[PDB]
Structure formats: C-alpha cells, structure tokens
Design a protein around this ligand. Structure first.
Ligand code: CL
Length: 266
C-alpha cells in the first residue's frame, strides 16, 4: 500500500548530503510570536501533500543564527520548520521545552490561517523537535512530556538530569567528541543510555567542539543527511530512509556510533 506521508523523489546519499534537497524553500518571520521570543518559519513549495512540522531551539545565550542552517536544509526535503529565539537567552531547558511546544502550536494555528504562507501545508498530527545544548535538553523534555511527537534529534544536549528513561519517541542524539561545555560522558551518552523504550541513535562527531552541529559546521553533509533521514523515517514512517536513518556511517568524521531498535531497509 502507498504510504500517505511519503514525499519527494527516492533518496540517494548525494541528494541527502547536498546543501539543499529537491523542494524550493521560502521563509517568513512570525509577526506576533505566542509563548516564545521570535520565530522564522521555513516551508517547501508543492511538496505533494501536507508535511510534518519541526521546532528547533538554540542553547543558553544563543539565538536562531546558531541553529538556523537546519531550517532550509530540512524544509527542502519536505518539512515545515520553525527556528526560535527564547523569551530570554538565559531560559533553562524546561522553559525552552514549553516555548518549543508553543512554537509548534503556532505553526498549527498558522496552518489554519488563510492569510499565512503555510495555510493547509502542515499535517499537525506529525511533529518533531530539535535543539542545541539546553535547547537539546528542552527537546528531550518535550519528547518525554509529549509522546505524541514523532521524532526528536537534539545536538550536544544538556540537562541537569540525564534520566530520559520514559521517552518512547525515536531519538537521534548528535554528540561532539571533545565537548567541554556539555561533556559527552556526563550529558549526551548517559542521556542516550537512559532510553530503553525507543528507536534511538547516538552519533558522535570526531574531534567536535560543543558547536560541531551548529550553523557553519564542517560536517553539514553527514549531519544534514542524518537529521533529514531520521525525520523522514520517523515523522513520515518512510522506509525509503530506513538505511540512511539506521546505518553506521562508517566514516572517519564519526568517533562513536550506537543505535537501538533501528532496522535497515528490508
Ligand atoms: Cl546551553
């Protein structure tokens, strides 16, 4: 049977590693942000049907610029993406999670607003969360509080507590090998090891600083391929992406790879 959520051409490693996918992307600034500081919405033209929505949150002291490369990258593969600024750059992970969920609710409100460029473009039942550092911890909190979310892909996450054992949402953790801000051995890896109820993955970037997955990084081909593949596999149930989502990249750019409940394409 046809998967009703499958969008776009059949993927290749080259198409997923490119700076942009097949869809043309447009963007707008949210005029009156509700429950968060500011937002930019990225969306594809003629994706072939409604698409899922992803909300991305930066870390402590940081703004949209640090995570905005994901906006066009994911939207060009068939997603509506909102990148946000928080009410204060000093907000903690629980506050970042509340603001991330408020941003997804505003994308759902704009989907039902005839004057919005994303009117009727979103399947509001299929949503995902991403973010860096405290925004990564906020994404894990969003997944723990909202198991109705379809995917999570935080990067260099940090939270006071690394226990995310209740999470049932498919979660990809990008980690940065040499992170001295949210060290892998006390943040990303214990967070990954705590989750025994989900599809999950741990991808550690070789020699990476805490900022190894932020805008301007030198691994956008691999990181972008993995982020899009994970969101495609789990937000769209798209088994054309099972191998890209679940595979060990076998790359010199990766210093540690682990995955669970993640089957390759049969
Ligand atoms: Cl942070």
């Amino acid at each position: 049977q046809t998967n009703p959520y499958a969008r776009g051409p059949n993927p290749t490693a080259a198409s997923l590693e490119a700076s942009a996918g097949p869809f043309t992307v447009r963007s707008f600034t949210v005029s009156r942000p509700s429950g968060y500081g500011a937002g930019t919405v990225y969306y594809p033209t003629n994706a072939g049907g409604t698409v899922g929505a992803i909300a991305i949150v930066p870390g402590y002291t940081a703004r949209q610029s640090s995570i905005k490369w994901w906006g066009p990258r994911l939207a060009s593969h068939g997603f509506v993406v909102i990148t946000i600024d928080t009410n204060s750059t000093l907000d903690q992970p629980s506050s970042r999670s509340s603001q991330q969920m408020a941003a997804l609710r505003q994308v759902a409100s704009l989907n039902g607003t005839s004057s919005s460029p994303i009117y009727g473009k979103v399947d509001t039942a299929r949503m995902g969360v991403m973010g860096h550092s405290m925004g990564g911890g906020g994404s894990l909190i969003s997944a723990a509080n909202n198991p109705s979310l379809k995917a999570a892909a935080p990067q260099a996450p940090w939270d006071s507590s690394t226990n995310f054992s209740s999470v049932t949402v498919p979660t990809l953790i990008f980690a940065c090998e040499n992170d001295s801000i949210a060290p892998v051995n006390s943040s990303a890896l214990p967070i990954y090891d705590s989750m025994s109820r989900n599809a999950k993955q741990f991808l550690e970037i070789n020699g990476g600083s805490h900022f190894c997955a932020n805008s301007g990084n030198s691994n956008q081909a691999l990181i972008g391929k993995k982020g899009v593949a994970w969101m495609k596999r789990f937000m769209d149930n798209d088994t054309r992406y099972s191998t890209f989502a679940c595979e060990n990249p076998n790359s010199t750019r990766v210093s540690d790879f682990r995955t669970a409940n993640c089957s390759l394409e049969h």
